[model samples]
Target: SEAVKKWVNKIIEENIIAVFAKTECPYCIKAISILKGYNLNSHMHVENIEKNPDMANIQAYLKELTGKSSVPRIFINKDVVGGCDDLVKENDEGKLKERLQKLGLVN
Candidate 1:
């Protein structure tokens, strides 16, 4: 079980960006949809941490990484952005572009 949790967390830590969410959460789905509009495809991964019980450490890692314990959390360069609404706002306002530029994914 510990290994499974570690594996799941690894999925988060390994990517430049990660979206942790439950499959059935509407807000989570919304976040995924917004992410779809971004060009930073190679840097992101979305995973359902709920299905993996071994990811307790991942939860802590996320809280620490983002300074907030929340679902549908978006991590850019392993840094936390926010849930679906935050992502949508960021994308619409062009803040996401600035963030991506810092990651060297955009100019």
Candidate 2:
């Protein structure tokens, strides 16, 4: 599963924002909807682990990386932004908008 770990790190480091989510999770759904409000046309990387054969391994690696084994693990600029509730709260406080603006994703 070293390759899975490598793949996870690569996606995180390479994307301006990366989200690891499962398809059926409602929090993941909301997390995606929240980000969809932003102009992340090209810089965002989203992986639906539900479709991957290494789904469990991905989650395992993510837990080791983020301290939580949860779907909708959101990362921004390779920083752990936490899960959907965290994303929701950050956006609720306008922190997310400010963050994206600083990143040039929004004006």
Candidate 3:
């Protein structure tokens, strides 16, 4: 658990939720929709693969980052959480919601 905290501190910015995805992918939309609803427009960063000109480099980094090289690669402050179902599971279980609340992103 402590090791994870160490890793987390090195990669991404604090309190910033980042999503790398494309609009054409349905699951991507599904993932973003959940995050969008919770956001206060404070710190969620979404990078659209379909519209980005830097996709080639972005794609390269995506694989290196998550090892899946897929869209809807969701993260909470640089923590790779997984795809739509995973996010849904986390939220439904109140795990994601709890963390977001603690982070002051939700109620």
Candidate 4:
């Protein structure tokens, strides 16, 4: 569990955009699709929960990290950006792009 937490936090620190997701999850798919529209596909690092061997521990770690137990949990520059609905809402309201631009992740 500690190892998973370490790795998860490590990746989050290393990437500008980090996403904890389940590949088959519709919400996860939507989240990725929305991010990709900004040409951020390569910049976004997603941890697919289904592929993780320590999935239960990973989920526990994420819940502890964000207080949520949902897939497609997003982080931008190591800051929690909530889940699919949150990301979509921000995108629709134009705040998501503003945040990305502020981070210099997008123009």
Which candidate number maximizes TM-score? 4
Best by lDDT: 2
Off by over 4 Å in 1: 1-9, 55-61
lDDT of candidate 2 over 1-107, digit per residue (tens)? 78999999999999988999887899988888789878685888889988999998999889998999889999999888999999989999999998899999999
CA error at residue 86 for candidate 3, angstroms: 1.6
Tens digit of per-residue lDDT, candidate 4, span 1-107: 57888999988999889998986799998898889889897778988877878888888888999999789889999899989999989998999999999988788
Compare candidates 2 and 3 on lDDT and give the better one. Answer: 2
lDDT of 2: 0.89
Task: Give the Å error, residue 90, model 1.
Answer: 2.1
How high is the CA lDDT of each candidate model? 0.75, 0.89, 0.72, 0.88
**For model 1, how does the per-residue alpha-carbon lDDT over 1-107 read when each residue is reduced to its tens digit?**
46655665676679877888865989988777766666667777888877776456666766766776668878777566878778889888989888888878777
User: What is the C-alpha lDDT profile of model 3 across 12-84, one tens digit per residue?
Assistant: 5654787778878998888888888886456876667668565666666666777776788778866778778
Prediction 1 global C-alpha lDDT: 0.75
Full candidate order by lDDT, most accurate first: 2, 4, 1, 3
